[PDB]
């Protein structure tokens, strides 16, 4: 799978509380995390479906 899928969820510097999905490699599935609102990294999706499609692997 892509390298960014293996990186820990990145909240970023902004201070909003935006619920996003990230791929948890250890768990083998996408989970939610708190995104701050700006400068998002790639392991950040608006849906579990988009997250698994991109980072679920094969």
């Amino acid at each position: 799978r892509p390298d960014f899928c293996l990186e820990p969820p990145y909240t970023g510097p902004c201070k909003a509380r935006i619920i996003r999905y990230f791929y948890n490699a250890k768990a083998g599935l996408c989970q939610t995390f708190v995104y701050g609102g700006c400068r998002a990294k790639r392991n950040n999706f608006k849906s579990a479906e988009d997250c698994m499609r991109t980072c679920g692997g094969a």
């Binding site: 909240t11 510097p13 902004c14 201070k15 909003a16 509380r17 619920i19 708190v34 609102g37």
Partner: protein, 223 residues
């Protein structure tokens, strides 16, 4: 708010919660039809909740009003965070009382050392997470621009101001964005960004409201 305290019930009547399913940002009521928040708190649909203390319990003093107009500053940069300010026009004028009140805009820019009150329902932990039911408060000073710049090398513009402590321990955090920084009864800052929360040498960065009084007044009068 990390390292703060629970605000006395409705002691911050200008504080509002921005909600789009769940609380995601704060804001400040500046007149019976307008709220000012951070531009990065933009969402196509926003419900403004006023008169809140416990955001997870219907207390009996709340007013729920939808955002009719959402106007971000025309020069907002989503990467540098310069001009991180946004105006929200309410679908209907709110009823002003002891629990729902307006906060005055700055008469001029407050100097470094001015003590202020920061508030919000953001994370209360620097490590891990704890979303508080009750509104949190924090008394903190506007820091010298030189210290702000030293803490955030090359990232601070004239439209930003650091508020907090260089030693860390107390700061605003995720869920506080768009919220108020009030000094001597005037809204001098808006919770914007920072590296982590309550970390030493990284106090929170806030939108310097005194640079936008005219933009706010002109925008309200035109909409």
């Amino acid at each position: 708010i990390v390292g703060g305290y629970t605000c006395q019930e409705n002691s911050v009547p200008y504080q509002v919660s921005l909600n789009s399913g769940y609380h995601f940002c704060g804001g400040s009521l500046i007149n019976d039809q307008w709220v000012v928040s951070a531009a990065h708190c933009y969402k196509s649909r926003i419900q403004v909740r006023l008169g809140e203390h416990n955001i997870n319990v219907l207390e009996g003093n709340e007013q729920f009003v939808n955002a009719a107009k959402i106007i971000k500053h025309p020069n907002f940069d989503r990467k540098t965070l310069n001009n991180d300010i946004m105006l929200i026009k309410l679908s209907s004028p709110v009823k002003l009382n002891a629990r729902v009140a307006t906060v005055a805009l700055p008469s001029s820019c407050a100097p470094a050392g001015t003590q202020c009150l920061i508030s919000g329902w953001g994370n209360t932990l620097s490590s891990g997470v704890n979303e508080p039911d009750l509104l949190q408060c924090l008394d903190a000073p506007l820091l010298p621009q030189a210290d702000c710049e030293a803490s955030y090398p090359g990232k601070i513009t004239d439209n930003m101001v650091c508020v907090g402590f260089l030693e860390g321990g107390k700061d605003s955090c995720q869920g506080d964005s768009g919220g108020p920084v009030v000094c001597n009864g005037e809204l001098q800052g808006i919770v914007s960004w920072g590296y982590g929360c309550a970390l030493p040498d990284n106090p929170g960065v806030y939108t310097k409201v005194c640079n936008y009084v005219d933009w706010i007044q002109d925008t309200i009068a035109a909409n």
